[PDB]
Design a protein around this nucleic acid. Structure first.
Ligand SMILES: Nc1nc2c(ncn2[C@H]2C[C@H](O)[C@@H](COP(=O)(O)NP(=O)(O)OP(=O)(O)O)O2)c(=O)[nH]1
Ligand SMILES: [Mg+2]
Ligand SMILES: [Mg+2]
Length: 430
DNA sequence: ATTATGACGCT
DNA sequence: AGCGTCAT
């Protein structure tokens, strides 16, 4: 009743750049704009692997993870841009720099948490209180929400999508009590106004379009963001959760798309998020552990407490390359050469990070994969990172991994290596 | 032969 | 510390 917390204390948004790497390449090359196009890394093997797809190309069935040659079968006029190659490997610097452009604009409006190269959570609670004081009980005009969808509306008592959007928004605004400065629905609405402004600023100052979700926590904001892509934003209210979750496959919720979600489905014999409400918190904890069980009990009611961490910069800076099938490294000279290439890229990125961000990494993590292992990492070993020197870093990585070489011979490497990975971690202010 | 990252939980 | 899971 009156003591049952409803998880409506915060306003949280999730901003995700639409087909990011594609947009970066389309800004640079106008010939790619408003076309089916995709971004690929490498080229020789099956045309390269697609990692980003414009919405025009998605209409033909092109997806991430698809080989470019296969995508061309679905979409013969697909345009391709290739990721830059440096020191023998894909180099993603152009997209990281574009990411920084966007994140610095977002940070003008509120403290953000960088969740990926192209997505950030925003805690808008305080900004919303400020705007509410400025409004002075003035209603919110639909004109201030020109790209906003209200999930679940319209309902009750009509052909085109923009008309649908406007009907739902009008129903939402008509039911708003702008008198009450602590109304959660009002707070979400003002949050949506602020996100319209943030998205307008991003597009004006970078050329990039994005989608966004506005709700009371990170998981609902993330789910909301996906409901109306591209170039739109969606408000998911607390009240919309029962209907939304009643047909929502468990795997759609961030963190339940893998083994844990499969176990929820299999153990409980359910399919949809909403079905979780019928279990007690102790029941869920008994199946899935204390932490997961409490999290699921709250999440299926729309409640989640994970804070938006004030963290605009990545916590690690890493370099990795796969050596699949027959390209695997089977000589010591090979392993040393590729460790050096990875370490030279890492040195370049670390030196730029130190100059930009007043910090220094102190730990080097070396990960390898050996032929035959189905795991991402076969071995992970750390050593000290005391100088930004590529030859030192590559020598240190070789020292920590050299005992994996089964070959009695000194020149050969067996079993051959199918992945190398260097990661700088444990930053300190400098 | 998807690949290149990056975050975080467990023990 | 090293490994696994979840992303994508
Ligand atoms: N190197 C690499 N980059 C990747 C990979 N997957 C994605 N990227 C890169 C390329 C992506 O552009 C970027 C952002 O990832 P998303 O937000 O998941 N996809 P997007 O923004 O394209 O589409 P949407 O409109 O649905 O949000 O990360 C990968 O496996 N490897
Ligand atoms: Mg995106
Ligand atoms: Mg993203």
């Amino acid at each position: 009743g009156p003591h049952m917390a409803t998880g409506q204390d915060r306003v949280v948004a999730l901003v995700d750049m639409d087909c990011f790497f594609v947009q970066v390449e389309q800004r640079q090359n106008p010939h790619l704009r408003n076309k089916p196009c995709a971004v690929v890394q490498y080229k020789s093997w099956k045309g390269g692997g697609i990692i980003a797809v414009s919405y025009e190309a998605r209409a033909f069935g092109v997806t991430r993870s698809m080989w470019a040659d296969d995508a061309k079968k679905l979409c013969p006029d697909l345009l391709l841009a290739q990721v830059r190659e440096s020191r023998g490997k894909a180099n993603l610097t152009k997209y990281r720099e574009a990411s920084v452009e966007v994140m610095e604009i977002m940070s003008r409006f509120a403290v953000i948490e960088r969740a990926s190269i192209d997505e950030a959570y925003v805690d808008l609670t305080s900004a919303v209180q400020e705007r509410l004081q400025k409004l002075q009980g003035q209603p919110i005009s639909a004109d201030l929400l020109p790209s906003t969808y209200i999930e679940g509306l319209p309902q009750g008592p009509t052909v085109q999508k923009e008309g649908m959007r406007k009907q739902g928004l009008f129903q939402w605004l008509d039911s708003l009590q702008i008198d009450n400065l602590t109304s959660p629905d009002l707070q979400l609405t003002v949050g949506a106004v602020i996100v319209e402004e943030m998205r307008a600023a991003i597009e004006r100052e970078t050329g990039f379009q994005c989608s966004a979700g506005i709700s009371h926590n990170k998981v609902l904001a993330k789910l909301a963001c996906g409901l109306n892509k591209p170039n739109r934003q969606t408000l998911v209210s607390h009240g919309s959760v029962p209907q939304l979750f009643s047909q929502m496959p468990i795997r759609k919720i961030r963190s339940l798309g893998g083994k844990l979600g499969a176990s929820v489905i299999e153990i409980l014999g359910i399919e949809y998020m909403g079905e979780l409400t019928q279990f007690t918190e102790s029941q869920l904890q008994s199946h899935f552990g204390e932490k997961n069980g409490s999290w699921l009990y709250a999440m299926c009611r729309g409640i989640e407490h994970d804070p938006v961490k004030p963290r605009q910069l990545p916590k690690t800076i890493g370099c990795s390359k796969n050596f699949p099938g027959k390209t695997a490294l089977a000589t010591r000279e090979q392993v040393q050469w590729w460790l050096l290439q990875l370490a030279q890229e890492l040195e370049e990125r670390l030196t730029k990070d130190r100059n930009d961000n007043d910090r220094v990494a102190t730990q080097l993590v070396v990960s390898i994969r050996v032929q035959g292992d189905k795991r991402l990492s076969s071995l992970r070993r750390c050593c000290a990172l005391t100088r930004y020197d590529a030859h030192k870093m590559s020598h240190d990585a070789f020292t920590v991994i050299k005992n994996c070489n089964t070959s009695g011979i000194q020149t050969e490497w067996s079993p051959p290596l199918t992945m190398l990975f260097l990661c700088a971690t444990k930053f300190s202010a400098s």
